[PDB]
Antibody, heavy 215, light 213 residues
Framework: EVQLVESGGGLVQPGGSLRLSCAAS????????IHWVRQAPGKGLEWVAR????????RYADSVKGRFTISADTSKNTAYLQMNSLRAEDTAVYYC?????????????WGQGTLVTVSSASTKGPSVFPLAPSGGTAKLGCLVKDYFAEPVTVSWNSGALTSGVHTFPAVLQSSGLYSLSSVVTVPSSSLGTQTYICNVNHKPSNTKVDKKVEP | DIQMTQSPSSLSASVGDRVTITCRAS??????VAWYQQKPGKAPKLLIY???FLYSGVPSRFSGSRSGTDFTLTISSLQPEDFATYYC?????????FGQGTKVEIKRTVAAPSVDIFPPSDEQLKSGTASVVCLLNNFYPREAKVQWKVDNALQSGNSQESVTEQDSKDSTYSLSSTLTLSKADYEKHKVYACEVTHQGLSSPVTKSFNRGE
């Protein structure tokens, strides 16, 4: 199966550097073009750069020309976006994709994307606080608070529970740290007999927390 | 630099409806136009390549059409999972360039919020902050008024809302309103109320709790 896996996102100070990777499986990058496309918050898609890994011919959008270098290594089947002099507008989710070297002359597979946050603020792990489940139906949650930068992944019961989950988009508080809540809807008859945990994960701060939620 | 001018920037349409999105190239691009569907916080998926060809695996209700420099994506009958932002992209020349996207909302019947109120957790007051969390569930339309009263007094500036993306099956929204108070402040008022005005509600529903009970 064709797959493009990205890594290297994170928090960067204004003026700083960050190197993204886009690792490919299920085909040869030497067979195609690899692109980087970015999406600034609540904005559209923006092409960033492309490379032909067989010769290293590269093209750049002008807004990153000079500051960004695209490159590939055909023995790791991986391509790279070295960014330097990052400014605040560069904050975006960076996707890679492949050009339809085989048939369809379009971007047919994509990476999952990696968030890049250009900001002076520093990392901070969240604190995870239960939302107390106070016969019809009942609801209970986990409040993830005061962290930076994005993102946090939260699952319920180590991933087993998926229905009725509602993980809200992170909102930025006046302090400059994000907060969000993740809430689930449960049957009343399950209270107590079934025990509920959330697996909050904030990779930039090595924060993995499971907080049991009970009445 | 060829520009793809996409319209409308957003639209609302009932399930089953026919939906057409337009991209206009600023110069001839032949058939080198692609159309992509992007669910929020997901990689774009390719729907149509070479202006009119269904990429393998895409449902048949998607189609693309060309009239000179005018490109049209059509969804013949809308499904709730089609909620997404749609982008056209030209690759005649370099730089390949996107339209500014069309955000497609599903229009559905009025559904009233079920609203719940959560007191701060004990670990939270230990650390010195108080977060009261008011939860409006599975409502349509998005427009909603969440009001905080403490001791029957109208709050302003200490709360913040967050809305889920439209649900891909029932097309409803969910919203959390969080009141942020210093622990001292939370400990200096008794009644904590959340009152929600929504079209599906005949009278605003207020959900209260009393500190320490």
């Amino acid at each position: 199966e064709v797959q493009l896996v990205e890594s290297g996102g994170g928090l960067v100070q204004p003026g700083g550097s960050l190197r993204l990777s886009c690792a490919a499986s299920g085909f040869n990058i030497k067979d195609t073009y690899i692109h980087w496309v970015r999406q600034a918050p609540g904005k559209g898609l923006e092409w960033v750069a492309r490379i032909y890994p067989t010769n290293g011919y590269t093209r750049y959008a002008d807004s990153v020309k000079g500051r960004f270098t695209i490159s590939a290594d055909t023995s790791k089947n991986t391509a790279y976006l070295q960014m330097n002099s990052l400014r605040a507008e560069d904050t975006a989710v960076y996707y890679c994709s492949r050009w339809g070297g085989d048939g369809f002359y379009a971007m047919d597979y994509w990476g999952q994307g990696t968030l890049v946050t250009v900001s002076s603020a520093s990392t901070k792990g969240p604190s995870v606080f239960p939302l107390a489940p106070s016969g019809g139906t009942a609801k209970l949650g986990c409040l993830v608070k005061d962290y930076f930068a994005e993102p946090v992944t939260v699952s319920w019961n180590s991933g087993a529970l998926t229905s009725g989950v509602h993980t809200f988009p992170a909102v930025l508080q006046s302090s400059g740290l994000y907060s969000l809540s993740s809430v689930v809807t449960v049957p009343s008859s399950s209270l107590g007999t079934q025990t509920y945990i959330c697996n909050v994960n904030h990779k930039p701060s090595n924060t993995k927390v499971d907080k049991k939620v009970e009445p | 630099d060829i520009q793809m001018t996409q319209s409308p920037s957003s639209l609302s349409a009932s399930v089953g409806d026919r939906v057409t999105i337009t991209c206009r190239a600023s110069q001839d691009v032949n058939t080198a136009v692609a159309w992509y569907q992007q669910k929020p916080g997901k990689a774009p998926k390719l729907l149509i390549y070479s202006a009119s060809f269904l990429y393998s695996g895409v449902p048949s209700r998607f189609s693309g059409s060309r009239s000179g420099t005018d490109f049209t994506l059509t969804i013949s009958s809308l499904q709730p999972e089609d909620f997404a932002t749609y982008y056209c992209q030209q690759h005649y020349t370099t730089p390949p360039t996107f339209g500014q996207g069309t955000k497609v909302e599903i229009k559905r019947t009025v559904a009233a919020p079920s609203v719940d109120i959560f007191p701060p957790s004990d670990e939270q007051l230990k650390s010195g902050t108080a977060s009261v969390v008011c939860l409006l569930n599975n409502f349509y339309p998005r427009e909603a008024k969440v009001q905080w009263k403490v001791d029957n007094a109208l709050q302003s500036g200490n709360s913040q809302e967050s809305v889920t993306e439209q649900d891909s099956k029932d097309s409803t929204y969910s919203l959390s309103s969080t009141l942020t108070l210093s622990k001292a402040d939370y400990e200096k008022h008794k009644v904590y109320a959340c009152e929600v005005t929504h079209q599906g509600l005949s009278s605003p529903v207020t959900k209260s709790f009393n500190r320490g009970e």
